């Protein structure tokens, strides 16, 4: 009766691994930038970084309107799954545009990549495009887990944990655009 929420602070510290990664990385980009846009430069129109954002933004509250109707508020079994589902959908979507764009950024470029501003950037997201792969797969896996096992009030450790991992992710994404895209350009 104490070891219950141990993996929590024991994961909350775990973010200090994927929290600094996203900081030194930014530092690289933040460097690989002032090199002055010399000729070849790929621009981005303010539409995808609004549909990408929105999507990934609804999740910030696809768990805010959920956590409660997940256990906190008097649990209701299923009433904690169909929502995860929706949530997984937006994850698979957010990752979609994250792929449509790239393709488009290699359909014109017949292979050979150039410059770092289509390098660092070209990777900055990648990570943010992987973190939201496993952190999007572990979610759905535990989904099928919450089925047979089925968690309940107080007893929900992981889904309130993950609701901190991901809740952090979007935070990192409430910059990406609000620094790279808009500002950069």
């Amino acid at each position: 009766h104490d070891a219950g929420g141990t993996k929590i602070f024991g994961f909350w510290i775990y973010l200090m691994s994927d929290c600094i990664l996203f900081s030194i990385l930014f530092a690289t980009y933040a460097v690989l930038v002032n090199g002055t846009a010399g000729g070849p430069t790929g621009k981005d129109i303010f539409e995808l970084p609004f549909v990408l954002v929105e999507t990934f933004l609804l999740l910030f509250s696809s768990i805010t309107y959920g956590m409660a109707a997940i256990a906190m508020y008097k649990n209701n079994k299923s009433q904690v799954i169909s929502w995860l589902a929706l949530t997984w959908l937006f994850g698979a979507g957010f990752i979609g545009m994250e792929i449509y764009e790239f393709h488009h950024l290699i359909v014109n470029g017949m292979g050979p990549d150039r410059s770092g501003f289509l390098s660092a950037f070209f990777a900055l997201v990648g990570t943010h495009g992987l973190h939201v792969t496993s952190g999007l797969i572990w979610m759905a896996v535990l989904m099928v887990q919450i089925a047979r096992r089925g968690l309940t009030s107080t007893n929900r450790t992981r889904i309130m944990c993950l609701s901190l991992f991901w809740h952090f992710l979007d935070v990192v994404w409430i910059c990406v655009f609000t620094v790279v895209y808009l500002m950069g350009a």
């Binding site: 690989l32 390098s119 990777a123």
Partner: protein, 501 residues
């Protein structure tokens, strides 16, 4: 799968491996004694570069690294008053991963195409190694696997300490070897990741043709250098902070007196942990640093002495009132308080920008650190190894040869590295394979001579221990040492009942 036994689990790896590293070094260090090609029989640098460089590549990440990840692994628990460690299955893999990197290292060596870019492996030298270049590749891989591992330990253990000590114990009653264990441990957290990123950046360079560091398309070297060196300095802190702990207890016990300046030392450990993420440029000075950015990174590191004095002086006062014993353990403790503070100045000296301009990457450099490492860190490992050898094996240490291996170990260090300092003033270029100036050719002989002794000693101890396990005076007491050694672990049986305690 039990923290305690995993603890040993480490040490083993280390020992079995120093039988390799040493051998490796013990051998190449010869070439600088005689002139010409020598009995070596080596064609151009190919191998020299590899070897002498692979060395330091190892000793830092695979044989001396285990120390902290090993010790805290076998003694932090039993003394705070617990039953094992927070994340079971994980504490296991924290090692098993550091293991992978092992066999993974001799994978680049099992083909003779092992890198030679500096234990760190700088740019223009790394990526340019032809398309067939799988050499550094293995190097960039072994440290990744191994990377993640030690990354957990600092997490795992961090939790154990912040949620599983002894009931009633306030964070203030925390033992020395524990306070320090925290500090250095948190470090592996807020610092070790840095490398991972960096290591990846390269990954793409040599594997995907990206230009994270190619200035011919957009990349820059002045970036890669910052990261490795930003997180590098810390590496030198997590590998000695813990020793403070081990050192404190080995001292206090036998001298029969509590560790003076408690609070004082307390924050020291704290302080020392802060002023570390902002002083890395002292590895940059030559690579063009802003005369003003010189200070922000040169001056910072210069204050870091004050924190070092605390510890030392504080242990002294722990001696001032007498009744100290000088057995195996307390003997190393000696060396520390000596050698360590020896090379210390060297760091206080190089601290100033210009003071190093002539010595940087010169033998002096090699002499500055091996000091604080060999006689400052490698002493710890051994020093502690004694104090706790029973608490984990069921038997005490042969005080005979223990006093023997010691001397050969203190003596030789100097006959093998104090000479290097000279070579530095006359300005000797590091990792060279071919030199000529008769002068250097001389000190080198002394140096390459200081080892013949150190070498043989690594044998005496290692042979003594064997003699200590098989043959033993089976101790059946609970505490072979005086009442001075007072930490919850001791009260326990040696060894502990298999299910801990």
């Amino acid at each position: 799968v039990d923290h305690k036994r995993l603890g040993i689990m480490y040490i083993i790896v280390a020992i079995v491996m120093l039988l390799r590293g040493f051998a490796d070094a013990i051998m190449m260090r010869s070439q600088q004694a005689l002139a010409s090609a020598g009995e070596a029989g080596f064609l151009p640098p190919h191998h020299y570069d590899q070897i002498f460089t692979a060395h330091g590549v190892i000793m830092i990440f695979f044989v001396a690294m285990p120390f902290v990840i090993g010790l805290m692994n076998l003694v932090v628990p039993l003394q705070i008053g617990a039953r094992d460690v927070a994340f079971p299955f994980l504490n296991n893999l924290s090692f098993w991963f550091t293991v992978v990197g092992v066999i993974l290292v001799n994978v680049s060596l099992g083909v003779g195409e092992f890198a030679q870019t500096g234990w760190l492996a700088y740019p223009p030298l790394s990526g340019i190694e032809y398309s067939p270049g799988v050499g550094v590749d293995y190097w960039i891989w072994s440290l990744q696997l191994s990377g993640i591992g030690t990354t957990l330990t600092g997490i795992n253990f961090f939790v154990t300490i912040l949620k599983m000590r002894a009931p009633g114990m306030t964070m203030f009653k925390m033992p020395v070897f524990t306070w320090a264990s925290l500090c250095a441990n948190v470090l592996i957290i807020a610092s070790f990741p840095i490398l991972t990123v960096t290591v990846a950046l390269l990954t793409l360079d040599r594997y995907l043709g990206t230009h994270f560091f190619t200035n011919d398309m957009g990349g820059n070297m002045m970036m890669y250098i910052n990261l490795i060196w930003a997180w590098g300095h810390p590496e030198v802190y997590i590998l000695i902070l813990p020793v403070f702990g081990v050192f404190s207890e080995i001292a206090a016990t036998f001298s029969r007196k509590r560790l003076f300046g408690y609070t004082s030392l307390v924050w020291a450990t704290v302080c020392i942990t802060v002023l570390s993420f902002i002083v890395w440029l002292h590895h940059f000075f030559t690579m063009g640093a802003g005369a003003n950015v010189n200070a922000f990174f040169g001056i910072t590191t210069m204050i870091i002495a004050i924190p070092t004095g605390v510890k030392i002086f504080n242990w002294l006062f722990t001696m001032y009132q007498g009744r100290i014993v000088f057995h195996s353990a307390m003997l190393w403790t000696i060396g520390f308080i000596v050698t360590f503070s020896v090379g210390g100045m060297t760091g206080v000296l190089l601290a100033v920008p210009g003071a190093d301009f002539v010595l940087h990457n010169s033998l002096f450099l090699i002499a500055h650190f091996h000091n604080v490492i060999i006689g400052g860190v490698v002493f710890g490992c051994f020093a502690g190894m004694t104090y706790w050898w029973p608490k984990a094996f069921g038997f005490k240490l042969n005080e005979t040869w223990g006093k023997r291996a010691f001397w050969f170990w203190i003596i030789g260090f100097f006959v093998a590295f104090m000479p290097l300092y000279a070579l530095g003033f006359m300005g000797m270029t590091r990792r060279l394979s071919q030199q000529i100036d008769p002068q250097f050719h001389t000190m080198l002989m002394i140096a390459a001579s200081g080892a013949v002794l150190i070498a043989l000693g690594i044998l005496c101890l290692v042979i003594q221990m064997y003699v200590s396990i098989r043959d033993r005076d089976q101790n059946r007491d609970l505490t072979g040492d005086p009442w001075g050694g007072r930490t919850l672990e001791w009260a326990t049986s040696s060894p502990p009942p298999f299910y801990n305690f």
